[PDB]
Point group: D2
């Protein structure tokens, strides 16, 4: 079995990977939004 | 995958030559934006739940001491 | 403080929300890929 | 956000009238695909780490019994 020391180490790694996923999602969402901006601009070009 | 794509979300060359690829792409964008918001909701939940599990582990590390 | 019973309940909810995020990512990636397919088709139209 | 977008990832109306909006969108696609793969790597890691924390909690629930 695992001890309390490794359990607390796993807990710290979980929280840091969670925050890490959060930061990747922000950067991902920033890029998806710019894809959307491009798509909206293309759509309006074809209606001008 | 789990939910596979409907004809309204599948973009074919037939769609492009009809000029509806752009609007289907904008539909995909709407769905992706909502899913991203849902995943944002869940990690906030996960962060909160993990932190509560963390305080349980901490208080029992100090009952040794 | 929280008890062992709620700690184990939190653990189950964490794993189920994790799997839940995984399923949302698959569906998200499926849709991003189709956006990419559209973009690749548009790019090749402008080079034909 | 954290990493803001470079001019190579920012899509302006100036880019569209130069006909490079499509290639910048394809650049954004490449970056998004890599980030999605990274987030996939991390949840596998998170699932494995959470499960190991789970077996510690289970074995201590049964040391009561
Ligand atoms: Mg279609
Ligand atoms: Mg640019």
């Amino acid at each position: 079995g695992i001890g309390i020391t490794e359990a607390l180490r796993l807990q710290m790694e979980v929280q840091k990977q969670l925050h890490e996923q959060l930061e990747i999602q922000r950067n991902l969402q920033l890029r998806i939004e710019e894809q959307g901006k491009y798509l909206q601009m293309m759509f309006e070009k074809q209606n001008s």
